[PDB]
Write a protein that binds this ligand. Structure first.
Ligand SMILES: NS(=O)(=O)c1cccc2c1c([N+](=O)[O-])cc1[nH]c(=O)c(=O)[nH]c12
Ligand SMILES: NS(=O)(=O)c1cccc2c1c([N+](=O)[O-])cc1[nH]c(=O)c(=O)[nH]c12
Lengths: 259, 258
């Protein structure tokens, strides 16, 4: 009867509480997805146990081994009943798991150090004194590689052959590069993470311009789950009631540090 | 049995065949949503009758009367079983009907007359020689009114008080305005429609820049429908199989004129 929820340590979605070793079970954790899991569980009427994905991954098919890793793998291989995490809805994942309606929308966005004279992707594309880049792997890099929109193709042509490399290995590294680069590096990343960091001390970064594309995070269940329909209904209702917007404001802005 | 499908005459989703007068039933119509209805019906295993919505509307709640009009109304009040049309997924509609996963994604986009020196919303926002606007009502105007993104707020502040009015009553009026203005009017509208018109003679308009926001069209059923889940599974499968991409290319590009 107890539903196993797989999730991932990613701020502000799921974080260890400061006193987690004194605590046990679900009370060890806090965050946007901790709150959302409680609301989903209420609407669907189940008891649940939050469990952090063992490999700290979201989920992809290991191309060497054909085996799914991450939270997706935990669902496919029967170890968890539901994933409640910032897990991107993608076609390759939809082949092996089901997603709810998105509970959060997002897109590629521009992070600058405050004071940088950049307002848009167009601004970046037409210049070079301010370097700009993405994660060295993953879907943000791929969006630019594949784009046939003129501005994003212009940007990809610059990034792919820029020296020294404008790509970074982790999000932390891209954010640190923005902060340390005295206005001469801009970093392309998820709007949600960009907005979160804009509310973190030292309050020296800023999101500029509109989002470049459209994606969503969804609640995932194994195919054939007795839960898929109730979960989708719960996301719909929570969205309609403003609960998702309330949780976003809680974890990004009420708990933000930059006013 | 026989599922009543409500839809709307909107190119290239649903159109009268040139020879519709000789024809009857579903065979009078052609288009992306006609083909999609046939595929959904196949995957779900039902026979169906296509019917054009009586009042020619998508669906809104008459704020005076509480009564839903359009295809949404036909679902809510039991006159149709499923809507297969370019019907936007919105929260106020989700309160009274169910939507599938989106079968088409779209967003606000910029139409220019070819030769116009504009590539982006930022380009429009920084000048005035080229007027630009939206429909006089609806969600594109609301997007600009409500936006807190600097560039779109700048565009709204310009549009709301621009003289003469930059707004238009119909999309036909906006496209004709672009075409007749020798490059001094640009029109903000749905990317899907912009892309369609770009492939139509006289081949004098163009979509520039990326989309400004994110929306979707979905298949709609009344709440509690025995069809909602099968319809959703069918959209998922048709998307995964590439059929939706194939139909888009058919009606926008294989059948394009440019
Ligand atoms: N700190 S980060 O820039 O944004 C970030 C960087 C890189 C990959 C991310 C990711 C985030 N995220 O928002 O938490 C979620 C997420 N979800 C997935 O499903 C996936 O495959 N990859 C990711
Ligand atoms: N520029 S337009 O593009 O010709 C167009 C103009 C105005 C409203 C539209 C609309 C389209 N469309 O794509 O067909 C679909 C649609 N669907 C709805 O549900 C709704 O409420 N309003 C609309």
């Amino acid at each position: 009867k107890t539903v196993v929820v797989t999730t991932i340590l990613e701020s502000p979605y799921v974080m260890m509480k400061k006193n987690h070793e004194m605590l046990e079970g679900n009370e060890r954790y806090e965050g946007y997805c901790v709150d959302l899991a409680a609301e989903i569980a209420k609407h669907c009427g189940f008891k649940y146990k939050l469990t952090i994905v063992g490999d700290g991954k979201y989920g992809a098919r290991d191309a060497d081994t054909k085996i799914w890793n991450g939270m997706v793998g935990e669902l496919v291989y029967g170890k968890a009943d539901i994933a409640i995490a910032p897990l991107t809805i993608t076609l390759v994942r939809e082949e092996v798991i089901d997603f709810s309606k998105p509970f959060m929308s997002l897109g590629i966005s521009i992070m600058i150090k405050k004071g940088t004279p950049i307002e848009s992707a167009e601004d970046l594309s037409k210049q070079t004194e301010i370097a700009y880049g993405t994660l060295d792997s993953g879907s943000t890099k791929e969006f630019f590689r594949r784009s046939k929109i003129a501005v994003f193709d212009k940007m990809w042509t610059y990034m792919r052959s820029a020296e020294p490399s404008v790509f970074v290995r982790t999000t932390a590294e891209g954010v640190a590069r923005v902060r340390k680069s005295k206005g001469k590096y801009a970093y392309l990343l998820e709007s949600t993470m960009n907005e979160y960091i804009e509310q973190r001390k030292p309050c020296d970064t800023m999101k500029v311009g509109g989002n470049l594309d459209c994606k969503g995070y969804g609640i995932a269940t194994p195919k054939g789950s007795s839960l898929g329909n109730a979960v989708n209904l719960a996301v719909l209702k929570l969205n309609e009631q403003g609960l998702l917007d309330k949780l976003k404001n809680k974890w990004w802005y009420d708990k933000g540090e930059c006013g």
